[PDB]
Amino acid sequence: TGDLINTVRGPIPVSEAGFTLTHEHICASSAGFLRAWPEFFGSRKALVEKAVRGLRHARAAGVQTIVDVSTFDIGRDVRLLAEVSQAADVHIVAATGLWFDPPLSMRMRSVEELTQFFLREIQHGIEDTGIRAGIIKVATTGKATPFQELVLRAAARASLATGVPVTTHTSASPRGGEQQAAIFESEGLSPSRVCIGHSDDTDDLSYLTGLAARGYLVGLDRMPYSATGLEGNASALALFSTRSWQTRALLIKALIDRGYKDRILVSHDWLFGFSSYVTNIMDVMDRINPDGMAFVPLRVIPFLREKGVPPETLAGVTVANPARFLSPT
């Protein structure tokens, strides 16, 4: 009690976040795209309706909060997030930071300038809305580019200044998490403020326990991205692993069994619109995972319980860990 987090609807007590999905998207797009071309998604109204239906389904399954890690360059539309949050009665935490599609006006900026931008979005508000980011999302695409290194440093500095956590996108080994951690540590950022994301890309437990032992949160955040029979579909195959979702879920158990229950964050990296990829990709995705953001509570959590993971441990992973992570510290 007492700790607060900023959501798209305003401040909430940390203790009310409850079952929280820490890496999700309402819509994965590009800066300005939803405003310029809403008909790409059918209409803005259709997108809202789809997202509200999806979040109500997650809510029915026990999800109380999602962290939308869409940055500026993922085309984050905080007004969209606020509308969907209100209609679905699910809290949404918005993000600042930069992903791997920064436009020239971002790419030309110094570390100091990027720090100011991230701070604006956390402390002042996003655009002219007054809605404040509650997380900082960064990305590397293998070895960090010089610009990506600036982004990571600016993220660390904004975090140090505000207490807001940092969360990352990694490629599937590199293993890019290690270089991210090195940069963060060089800036004096506490590992407990950082989630190294997409860490379920591989089953490298030495890598994962290595990060966890140092205090990092490990984001096992692509839980539903498993499918069979996609070989005649190149674009879909790129998204969905042959590894059964059961295999991804077993990684959660593997980390728990090794003593790292407090260092795990679980999510889907799901979405309700996706313009930064091939046209009609949603059709494929929704057929594979019709449960959307309810997949984790409906399938992953019961599977773990049925494998003998204690209910208290599962609550710790899905409630306590996100609360500790999101609490400005």
Min separation Cβ 269 and Co ion, Å: 4
Query: Residue 168 forms beta bridges with which residues?
Result: 138
Q: Please list, in sequence order, all residues whose beta carbon lies within 8 angstroms of the beta carbon of residue 197, skipping any fewer than 6 positions away.
A: 23, 69, 167, 168, 169, 170, 219, 221
Residues 266-285 binding Co ion (CB under 5 A) are: 269
- Interface residue with its own copies among 73, 83, 201, 221 (CB under 8 A) is 73
Which residue, 82 or 106, has its beta carbon nearer to its own copies?
Answer: 106
Sole residue written with tokens 């069979």: 228
C-alpha distances (whole Å) from 154 to each of 148, 151, 166, 325, 328 are 10, 5, 11, 19, 17
Q: List, comma-separated, the residues after which the chain is broken, a break being a C to N distance over 2.5 A; otherwise answer none.
A: none
Residue 147 interacting with its own copies (CB under 8 A):
no
Q: Specify whether the CB–CB gap between 321 and 265 falls below 8 A.
A: yes
Task: State the minimum distance, in angstroms, from the CB of residue 69 to Co ion.
Answer: 5
The item of Co ion, its own copies, none sharing an interface with residue 201, based on CB under 5 to 8 Å by kind, is none
Q: Which residue has the tokens 């999806």?
A: 54
Q: Is 137 annotated as a binding residue?
A: yes
Q: Closest CB to Co ion among 57 and 169?
A: 169
Residue 308 three-state SS: coil
128 binds its own copies (CB under 8 A): yes
Q: Which of 187, 205, 303, 329 is nearest to 263 (CA)?
A: 205
CB atoms within 10 A of CB 259: 11
Of residues 124 and 206, the one with the C-beta less far from its own copies: 124
Residue 72's binding partner among Co ion, its own copies, none (Cβ under 5 to 8 angstroms by kind) is: its own copies
Q: Which of 127, 203, 247, 259 binds its own copies (CB under 8 A)?
A: 127
Q: Please say whether the dihedral angle defined by the alpha carbons of residues 18, 24, 29 and 32, taken in this order, is positive or negative.
A: positive
Q: Count of residues binding its own copies (CB under 8 A)?
A: 34
Helix (H) or strand (E) holding 321: helix 321-326
Compare residues 97 and 297 and give the one whose CB is closer to its own copies.
97
Nearer to its own copies, 39 or 306 (CB): 39
Pairing mode, strands 135-139 and 166-169: parallel
- Contacts for 110 with CB less than 8 Å, ≥ 6 apart: 150
Contact set for its own copies, span 271-290 (CB under 8 A): 275-279
Choose among its own copies, Co ion, none what residue 269 binds, the Cβ cut-off being 5 to 8 Å by kind: Co ion
Binding residues for its own copies, rule: CB under 8 A, are 29-33, 35-37, 39-40, 72-73, 75, 101, 103-106, 108-110, 113, 116-117, 120-121, 126-128, 275-279
Binding residues for Co ion, rule: CB under 5 A, are 169, 269
Q: Which residues are annotated as a binding site for Fe(2+)?
A: 23, 25, 137, 269
